[PDB]
Design a binder for this molecule. Structure first.
Ligand SMILES: Cc1ncc(C[n+]2csc(CCOP(=O)(O)OP(=O)(O)O)c2C)c(N)n1
Ligand SMILES: Cc1ncc(C[n+]2csc(CCOP(=O)(O)OP(=O)(O)O)c2C)c(N)n1
Ligand SMILES: [Mg+2]
Ligand SMILES: [Mg+2]
Lengths: 584, 585
């Protein structure tokens, strides 16, 4: 039946007995693509019956559906014209892993971050209302995403529309790990009272409410969804789904199966089984030790403990000293700041792309008060996650231009661990550390253990004519540029490990004027608002020439990394070529 | 006077109920004098008198810790914790800021100005206590308006998991700055109308314990409630109903006006300087009321600060469904605007520079990744305006201009501003932000471009040589003056440029200047790091062009003297000219 689904109209042609068979067909096809190609396993298997019912009852694209995150919209794409991308291995990559309007009229937003569906959906509804449309507007949002303040604001506003607004809460009792927040006790009393409970968070927020206990039964959902169709006021449809339904291993281990690398369908084991530790593992190793020796130390995550190497066992080990605040980046920062104000030693670890949510809290809650909380920022690089919503391109311009902030850029493992140890020990600054997005590199030479004199860059090779400031993960690159500059142009360049993203070594920059005419900067991130521009500004009235290397200010999506680097001149021979072109 | 003998909460605990009530009276008298003479947040502090007395009657600050949301309503806190003379003697009026400040007092635990952060910062204090085995009480005080902000939701959500002492005072006076907005406020009405007994309780749904206090301006009732929860061993909400501006008739009848007053006549309520003339907020209101009438797809959005758009309660009435107030939810305001523009609407979101700082990810992902043509109006961006540390409008350029796909415009005069806003509404190709000039309303006097679709065209306004001046936005006048004095003092005829586009560089014009110029300077009204000027420096980095960038340093300042600060950053005509000559010779 699935081979003949080209739009929601074809879904409406089926009998209910046929809808159930289609559910099976979808799961078979998902099992193949997801085991071969990786992806969000649990969220999509759990969403099968609700997506069929959604496109059975509603008339997309007049009616519009918005998924929170969109990591769970595979079945949506499967039923709106993109099935061939899931049935034929040769076409696995013809769709992104998130919603995309360029692919389909059935997709209204590129979405990857959490708790944004409800807000964007109310945008659609208000737009309808101002222009006299009459379509249904649906947001689909996970129970974990409910912990984000943007979703609270969206619900708050939705309760005021006075018009059609449909909010499907997909309650599978799981975020990535387990949920956290007192709200989840409310969700729970409601499931147990079959939606009957008087004290209802959603009703307290001003909204109407209905509950569906069998979130994996096409009939129940069609029933539910038909009841709310063409409704004229805001309503919540709270449904209970079983995360990863239809695949035993997923049902028994929900955290592991939220996202899988390619694996064996029969055993569930990954296809490539060797792994060497990454900086996440290291970091978990360090904090479990420190937290044992020093009861003031507390590790914090916003719904992504794995970014800190914190398996369910390790969380258990850490007990009261490991905190998961839900998907609430804003709060994580203010919490860290208050902890540090009343004698605790907080360490908040977060992805670069997600820390984008907390600019004002970093600035006001944290830095105005100058509290010594520690922030670890992971995966900041131009060569990592490469879909547009998860681009870790912007943390240097996000963070490094805030007053009072100290942002450190380690280049190797012992240095990373030394700044982190010093971070916890000091009491004078908020400290953020850009965890290197590389394999774990051994420093091989003893490293400074005190970073209290700010903005001292470390010369690692005395040279002349050209100086290279190779920041963080791009130290390796500065090293290769040094070699190739020597072998092809016989320039012996000064190589510099800057360490401090948040300031300029004025005195060294001055000393370089003597035996150098060109300084270049390499940074693993976008150029606008980043580190290199400060160097350009410092030399602006002097006879020192400067080149800045990094990523251009532009969105890119599922790109080839070799290209993107070359396109931005981030290769050793492109850099040396540019130097000589400037020198002569 | 009892108030002259208060140096700490210990002194507050000495009084009887009759003396506490007399003390309430003295505080209001003293407040009326300070606020009518010196201005300030009138309504919120008059509403908080009895609750602040009771707090320091029952709790033992600074061992116990109190955190005020925003802290605009912490004047009585200061009056009862040792800083009373800053409220009794006019000569010392300025010896305290209008917000909490730890440098002033150990009774102050955070510098706080923005909304909905108390609960989160307070839970931090509690978690820290818990990690070190303290046993002090931890209190957050939050207004009903601040509850509409998502940080407050996350904080409550987290607090409900502590399993330890946590006291959250909700000061419900049924007002934000204007009236509240959000469905949650209907549940608050239910709770107040049922004297806290209603089954449907938002606070209990969040995992929290709860009690209600119907007379939030009665010392006895508050002492009562606060004593019951003292040393409680789990998180609790104490929901109290206060009358905004209690004790002063004119404020009680107009709560929106008296949220904040310039100095005024205690007897008439009239401002001491009553002449008012049109500013860009007023201009903006006029434009949007016209367009919204002519074009039914236009909708104006505020995040609880409608005055920033000149939107008096009448004007809101007029605009009806076409004027939207989303509460204090800056983040949501952006995503709403983006969804509106995706479904045939034309949204115009107006916001203060200092507050738009909340929405970086929403600007980036909700708005700019999808490239939706929502319009953003960013007010008060300047180094010469609001000058307390938490309300510094220094950072909107580095916050916004480095987001990909964003078009961010800097008008220099009034006709240009409106022409830029008209085009913004008409185009369908870009998200557009407009940095409303933080100057007097200046008439352009020469006809202005009406189409801004070809991006990154800087407008040469005077052809010269040797030195070129890129004077962005509010600093166009300053660039005009640097040109004059350069001409009068060094006999250089400098090229003057109005750049307009903050978000890009005129490659072509920048290249042509290399012919008849050796120096380029940039002037911007904001912090330099991540700002406009650095893109010019970077562009010329490999050329023989020299560049200077003028703006504010990356540094926090608080209640500063503005002339001083300008001089310190070389932001004067005589300092810029001097630096130019110092580079040339
Ligand atoms: C802003 C932001 N913060 C954090 C994340 C991390 N994240 C990606 S998917 C996901 C799961 C969301 O949980 P829920 O909505 O309950 O869905 P489920 O996995 O249970 O289907 C999370 C936390 C994100 N994508 N964006
Ligand atoms: C982030 C942010 N957005 C907006 C404001 C504007 N603002 C300043 S004071 C205030 C009033 C808050 O109202 P409420 O919390 O109910 O207190 P009340 O004035 O009624 O005592 C507002 C909206 C702000 N300070 N910070
Ligand atoms: Mg979930
Ligand atoms: Mg209020």
């Amino acid at each position: 039946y699935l081979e003949n689904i080209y739009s929601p109209a074809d879904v409406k042609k089926l009998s209910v007995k046929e809808l159930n068979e289609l559910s099976d067909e979808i799961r078979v096809s998902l099992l193949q693509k997801l085991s071969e190609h990786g992806g969000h396993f649990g969220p999509n298997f759990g969403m099968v019956e609700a997506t069929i019912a959604l496109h059975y009852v509603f008339n997309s694209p007049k009616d519009k559906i918005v998924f929170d995150v969109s990591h769970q919209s595979y079945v949506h794409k499967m039923l709106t014209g993109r099935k061939n991308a899931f049935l034929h291995p040769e076409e696995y990559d013809l769709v992104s892993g998130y919603t995309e309007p360029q692919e389909s009229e059935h997709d209204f937003f590129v979405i990857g971050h959490t708790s944004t569906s409800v807000s964007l959906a109310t945008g659609l509804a208000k737009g309808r209302d101002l222009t006299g449309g009459n379509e249904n507007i649906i947001a689909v949002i996970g129970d974990g995403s409910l912990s984000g303040g943007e979703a609270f604001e969206g619900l708050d506003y939705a309760a005021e529309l006075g018009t059609n607004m449909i909010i499907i809460v997909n309650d599978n009792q799981m975020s990535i790990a387990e949920n956290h927040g007192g709200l989840y006790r409310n969700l729970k009393e409601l499931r147990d009272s079959n939606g009957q409970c008087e004290c209802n968070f959603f009703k307290a927020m001003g909204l109407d409410y209905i509950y569906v206990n069998d979130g994996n039964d096409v009939q129940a959902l069609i029933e539910a969804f038909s009841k709310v169709k063409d409704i004229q006021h805001p309503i919540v449809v709270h449904i209970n789904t079983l995360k990863g339904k239809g695949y035993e291993r997923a049902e028994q281990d929900k955290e592991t199966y939220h996202w899988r690398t390619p694996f064996n369908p029969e055993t569930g084991e990954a296809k490539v089984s060797y792994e060497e530790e990454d900086y996440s593992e290291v970091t978990a190793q360090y904090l479990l030790k420190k937290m044992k020796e020093d009861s003031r130390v507390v590790t914090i995550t916003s719904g992504t403990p794995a970014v800190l190497g914190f398996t369910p066992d390790r969380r258990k080990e850490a007990g009261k000293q490991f905190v998961d605040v839900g998907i609430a980046e804003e709060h994580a920062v203010a919490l860290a700041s208050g902890i540090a104000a009343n004698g605790g030693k907080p360490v908040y670890g977060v992805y670069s792309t997600f820390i984008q949510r907390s600019y004002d809290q970093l600035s006001q809650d944290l830095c105005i008060n100058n509290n010594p909380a520690v922030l670890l920022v992971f995966w900041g690089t131009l060569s990592g996650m490469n879909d547009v919503t998860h681009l870790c391109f912007f943390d240097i311009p996000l963070i490094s231009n805030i007053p009072n902030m100290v942002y450190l850029a380690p280049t190797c493992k012992e240095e990373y661990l030394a700044m982190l140890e010093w971070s916890i020990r000091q009491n004078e600054h908020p400290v953020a550390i850009r965890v290197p997005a590389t394999d774990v590199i051994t420093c091989g030479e003893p490293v400074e253990t005190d970073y209290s004199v700010l903005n001292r860059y470390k010369v690692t090779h005395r040279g002349a004519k050209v100086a290279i400031l190779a920041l963080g993960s791009f130290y390796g690159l500065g090293q290769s540029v040094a070699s190739l500059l020597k072998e092809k142009a016989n320039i012996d360049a000064t190589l510099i490990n800057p360490r401090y993203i948040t300031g300029v070594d004025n005195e060294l920059m001055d000393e370089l004027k003597a035996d150098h005419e060109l300084v270049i900067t390499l940074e693993d991130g976008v150029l606008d608002g980043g580190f290199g521009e400060k160097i350009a500004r410092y030399y602006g009235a002097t006879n020192m020439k400067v080149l800045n290397f990094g990523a251009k200010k532009e969105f890119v999506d599922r790109y080839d990394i070799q290209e993107f680097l070359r396109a931005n001149h981030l290769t050793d021979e492109q850099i040396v070529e540019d130097i000589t072109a400037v020198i002569g």
